[PDB]
Design a protein around this ligand. Structure first.
Ligand code: NA
Ligand code: NA
Lengths: 146, 145
């Protein structure tokens, strides 16, 4: 479908699906395989890359054969925002009826129109109104890059 | 540097820096090279990957011997992802410890978090949203979700 294609093109589709399932409690290689309908060799490469990226950590599960489960890391827990963003990105310019994947309010089924930025004072502004800039701790090199 | 390192582990640091430059009007190879202080092989790898991902488009600049790279509509939309990666990388850094910051452009005011504006006019924490199957999902897709 269109959002899978965009997300594959940008290299995040499987990471999004696996991270999502890991954050929902899936742990064992076979859980991932059956639930995501993904071939083993590819599941393995994608798990290892999530691990190398520091988003999941492998932890012993059993002895003979020694098998591992995959549990999210504090970073991976935080990565939820990024995954959600990739979907809002992928759904940009697609009408809601028709969408195969949606960012919604978990309580109702209410779809998310857009991300907003919450400032310290209470106010919410659109992202178009925000910018990436150098921070107080930034080196000379960082300042130049920004 | 801390944030650069986490963002590099996730394969996005140079992408963030290049897209932001492109979104700001940098076009040519040496512009990115000097502004970002990036070596040419790395820059070639990253520019090509951004083109291949459909985020930048490469157009002809000159004969003997150059291209320019302009953001695509998908690339303009990518802002939210770049900003989300920065918020992610700043999660757990108190403000005075940050080298890269997400701020309101008008004032220097730091962005504390993202919220979600909903269809019914409400705005809730992103922490309260979820990715789920949409109305058009195939059978395969509903299983994946
Ligand atoms: Na993918
Ligand atoms: Na990188």
């Amino acid at each position: 479908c269109p959002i899978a294609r965009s997300l594959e093109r940008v290299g995040e589709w499987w990471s999004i699906l696996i991270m999502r399932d890991a954050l929902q409690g899936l742990r064992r290689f076979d859980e991932f395989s059956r639930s995501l309908d993904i071939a083993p060799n590819m599941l393995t490469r994608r798990l290892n890359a999530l691990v190398e990226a520091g988003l999941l950590e492998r932890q012993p599960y059993s002895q003979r054969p020694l098998r591992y489960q995959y549990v999210p890391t504090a970073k991976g827990e935080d990565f939820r925002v990024v995954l959600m963003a990739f979907v809002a990105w992928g759904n940009r310019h697609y009408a809601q009826q028709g969408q195969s994947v949606q960012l919604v309010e978990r309580t109702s089924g209410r779809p998310v129109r857009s991300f907003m930025a919450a400032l310290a004072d209470g106010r919410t502004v659109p992202l178009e109104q925000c910018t990436v800039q150098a921070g107080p701790a930034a080196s000379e090199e960082m300042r130049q890059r920004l």
